[PDB]
RNA sequence: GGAAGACCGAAACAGUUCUGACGUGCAAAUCGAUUGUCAGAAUUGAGUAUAGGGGCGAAAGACCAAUCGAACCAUCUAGUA
RNA sequence: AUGAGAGCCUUGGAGGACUGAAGUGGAGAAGGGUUUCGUGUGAACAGUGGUUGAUCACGAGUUAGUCGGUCCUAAGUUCAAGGCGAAAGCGAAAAUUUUCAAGUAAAACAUAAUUUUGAACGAAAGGGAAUACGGUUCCAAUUCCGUAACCUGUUGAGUAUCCGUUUGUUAUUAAAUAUGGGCCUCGUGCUCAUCCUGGCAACAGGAACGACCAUAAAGAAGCCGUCGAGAGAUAUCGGAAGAGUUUUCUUUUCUGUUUUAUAGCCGUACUACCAUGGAAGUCUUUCGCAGAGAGAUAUGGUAGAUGGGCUAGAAGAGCAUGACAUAUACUGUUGUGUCGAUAUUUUCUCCUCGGACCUUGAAAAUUUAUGGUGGGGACACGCAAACUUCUCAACAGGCCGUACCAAUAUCCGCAGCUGGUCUCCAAGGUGAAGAGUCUCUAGUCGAUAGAAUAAUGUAGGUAAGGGAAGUCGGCAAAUUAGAUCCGUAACUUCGGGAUAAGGAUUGGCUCUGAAGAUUGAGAUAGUCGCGAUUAUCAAUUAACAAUCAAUUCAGAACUGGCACGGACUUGGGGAAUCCGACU
RNA sequence: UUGAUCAAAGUAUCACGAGU
């Protein structure tokens, strides 16, 4: 049916302090368990697509994760996409070279 | 078939507000939130956000323009007016 | 434990079976509309993707040419396909009209 | 209830420990004027609020 | 019991430390579970041949408390 | 294909006609039949502003703690006839 | 039964009916403040009694690092002394107030460009260190024990890191993260030096250089409808186990089958990337439109797995279903936990895109990575070391709030008063459905009583004729009501009016016709010994050949109060006027 | 033409040294 489910923490109203689910027990009793907010990832910033390679998290619990889980080997690793940076390196590279020949 | 007979996209707002006020939003919402050839992205992917603030959905160029069409005929005239005049001051 | 009183579902497995020979739904019980008894946006959902599920087998078994979907997709984006029956003769005819022509 | 505070937990003992009746011998003083109490609280014929 | 370990030498290597005050074993009809309560963790070897108990039970640190239920 | 201050309807609310049920009640305004909206000018729990000749009012002089053409509480107040 | 004495309440035995999962049910908020519990009871108290009570008498009863106040800040209190007022104090975007800088390991010779309001309160509904599971008492449990993790801070131990060579080892090798180099008699000599290695890439790995300055995100969302998966709630099918009924019949209607956090490994739904490749006879793709020489289909890969699934958790864990045996006792012991499927927004969840919009959908505490000049590590015959973002051990974590009602008997309604009260879970059937009628699951009989068929009233009705005459007036009240099939008038701003009106049709029972999914089926020649073993693909094949499948249709025979949506859900209609446009 | 730059180099003469 089941013999229904209360809340057990104090707050009652269906709010974003507690999204919540129902799992079972070893008794068949199903107390009303709640989970956290949802974990997700940082961005590229320029291209603004939720990036690739980086674990879901919050910034709350984030510092107790190891370095590989945080980012990747290249510069601006979880700060930029590789779509971003390939546009971002060469852009001045001709222009600074153009700044050579324009300085003559 | 020819589904309505005149009104087109204001047909949601029917039997209301008057005759030549049902028509005046037709002539100003058959342009708005239709798709436009982007001057930069080349494709046809132009919808609105609010008044005068269009963005693409592809290649992420966003351009400020007219408020019921992509850019008014008032606007490019100015973009043509400052164009011919700019070569006159320093030259 | 005060051993419980039976709440028997016995009559229920004679209504959800006599529907399997339709003993109860003529006109006299259809109190809802036929529309939201079985809605269009799920009725048209079932037929349209099922023909796609025949299509992707027929896309890449070998049996229909690659260019013979992007004129047969518009028809499947159109209307004129009631069953999966009528699709196959309008292949077997039209795969024959491409055959003998070559 | 259930989210009180550390005045209203200590205030509520004083408006609880004052809810006995008379001391059960002290009507044998001299000049006994005390029959049963002045401040005597029920809780639906008397409110608290202070 | 948040970890399992299938190797046998490290199952004895992790035995002798400051933790691992006790060892809980259990004889299933299926297999045998090796529960060794450590301080933070707990380690588990699964063994199911019903004969490699004695050679790998002793094989023990001698002062270890054995929790024997069968 | 599911958009609109679109429709009939339920807990949410409102309060129309019966001028029906008690009118020393169930009540210093409610019960029972009936009726309207019901995906927005919607409905609402908490926090905070606004002050007595003023606050606030999708405007009736409504509402401001059962009081509202000026409250509410002590005085000059045994105020005058 | 008990009680001096019982229609109650006070029980416990039956067993009748209600509350119907948008309850009279289980637990949460505000407010209550000892009501919750046992024990004991005489009188007022319970608009009747009273043996029990929300009354007294008398005793106990609320345990935390993880639930939460606590920090952050929101509209806003105007709350440093620039100012004004006779003073109190100011229906005040106090932005002017030597330095009104927080400061910053800092350098002489106002440490350097830097910081504008200095301060604080303000949310047990927003932001936010981290946990749950089984049992347990006279009443307490994410708190107590049993057992099983984590966080924050502190401390400690190990932990890339010893080279060519040659100590081990003839050398090939090996401690040595990978030594070379010219020289030299080889080099022994000399010189050269490690602040990690992988992939074409996306990125990967157990750890491997922040002290500051710097960007860049997260922290950070509104609301609508959505295909994909999953969770649990249920429902049918089958093994099990034990209960249900028996005149009669029923391979039958029942309970019950479970596995939490935190972990490791497999690890696809699914969009977006990478390599290739160069598509028009355009092509791919969804419920849609979305997509493409700014690289589409492909071929493989990358990463997110929230998701699952086995194994850790799992003492036949514990639990539960029952076994047996023990006066029996905190006992004993036996057995079970096995599979498929089918669907739903009678609910939540990650993910996917689109939608209205002069409606663009909060801040900040705390936090990551990157950038950055300096600076500090930093020998190769090694000793290592590492706020090391690694493994792992000791070590504490204070403060208070917790019992109960949570409203037809603990609130406010002067009261135990049909009255207004914030949200949470939410079942069987019929059915459009969270309707409305009905039962299981939980719980209630609590509304003064046994009696008695007068009016009038109070509400629920039918009444032969005619049918508005009645009365201010068609107002109470009656017909209509669901769905399918047509059939739709004038006026229209051409979106209506539209359910117009005006109609037919509608059980039960017995059947055929249709709407899908997985293996397609699979010749042919021989082998071993029909068993076993080895292969191309047209026709097939339209509900092929095996197999399982939802449920809504589309008809037809035959039959019954001649009543058919049988109660419930639920519309009377039509020309005109005059308003006001409308919601 | 959606990167980006801060934190003295250069120079000069003195310190023109200390240690050595």
UniProtKB/TrEMBL annotation, chain A:
GO terms for cellular component: cytosolic large ribosomal subunit; cytosolic ribosome. GO terms for molecular function: structural constituent of ribosome. The keyword Ribosomal protein applies. Signal peptide: none annotated. It comes from the Eukaryota. Coiled coil: none annotated. Keywords: Ribonucleoprotein, Ribosomal protein. GO terms for biological process: cytoplasmic translation; ribosome biogenesis. Disulfide bonds join 44-81, 81-84. Belongs to the eukaryotic ribosomal protein eL34 family. This is Large ribosomal subunit protein eL34. The gene is RpL34b. The chain holds residues 1 to 104 of 168 of the full protein.
């Amino acid at each position: 049916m089941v013999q229904r489910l209360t809340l057990r923490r104090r707050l009652s109203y269906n709010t974003r302090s507690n999204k919540r689910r129902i799992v079972r027990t070893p008794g068949g009793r199903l107390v009303y368990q709640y989970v956290k907010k949802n974990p997700t990832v940082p961005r590229c910033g320029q291209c603004k697509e939720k990036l690739k390679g980086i674990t879901p998290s919050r910034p709350s619990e984030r510092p107790r994760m190891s370095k590989r889980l945080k980012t990747v080997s290249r510069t601006y690793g979880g700060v930029l996409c590789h779509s971003c940076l390939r546009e971002r390196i060469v852009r001045a590279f001709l222009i600074e070279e153009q700044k050579i020949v324009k300085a003559l | 078939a020819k589904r309505t007979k005149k009104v087109g996209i204001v047909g949601k707002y029917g039997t209301r507000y008057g005759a030549s006020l049902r028509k005046m939003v037709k002539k100003m919402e058959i342009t708005q939130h239709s798709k436009y050839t982007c001057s930069f992205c080349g494709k046809d992917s132009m919808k609105r956000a609010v008044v005068g603030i269009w963005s693409c959905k592809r290649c992420k160029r966003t351009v400020a323009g007219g408020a019921w069409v992509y850019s008014t005929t008032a606007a490019a005239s100015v973009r043509s007016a400052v164009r011919r005049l700019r070569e006159t001051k320093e030259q | 434990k005060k051993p419980v009183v039976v709440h028997s579902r016995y009559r229920v497995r004679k209504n959800t079976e006599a529907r399997r020979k339709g003993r109860h739904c003529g006109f006299g019980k259809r109190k809802g509309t036929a529309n939201a008894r079985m809605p269009t946006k799920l009725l048209w959902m079932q037929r349209q993707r099922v023909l796609r599920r025949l299509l992707k087998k027929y896309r890449d078994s070998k049996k229909i040419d690659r260019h013979l979907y992007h004129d047969l997709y518009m028809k499947c984006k159109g209307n004129v396909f009631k069953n999966k029956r009528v699709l196959m003769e309008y292949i077997h005819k039209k795969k024959a009209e491409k055959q003998r022509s070559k | 209830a259930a989210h009180k505070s550390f005045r209203i937990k200590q205030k509520l003992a004083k408006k609880l420990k004052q809810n006995r009746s008379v001391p059960q011998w002290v009507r044998l003083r001299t000049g006994n004027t005390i029959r049963y109490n002045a401040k005597r609280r029920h809780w639906r014929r008397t409110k608290l609020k202070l | 019991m948040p970890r399992e370990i299938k190797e046998v030498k490290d199952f004895l290597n992790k035995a002798r430390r400051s933790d691992a005050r006790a060892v809980k074993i259990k004889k299933n009809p299926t297999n045998t579970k090796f529960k060794i309560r450590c301080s933070r963790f707990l380690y588990t070897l699964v063994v199911q041949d019903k004969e490699k108990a004695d050679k790998i039970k002793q094989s023990l640190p001698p002062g270890l408390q054995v929790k024997e239920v069968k």
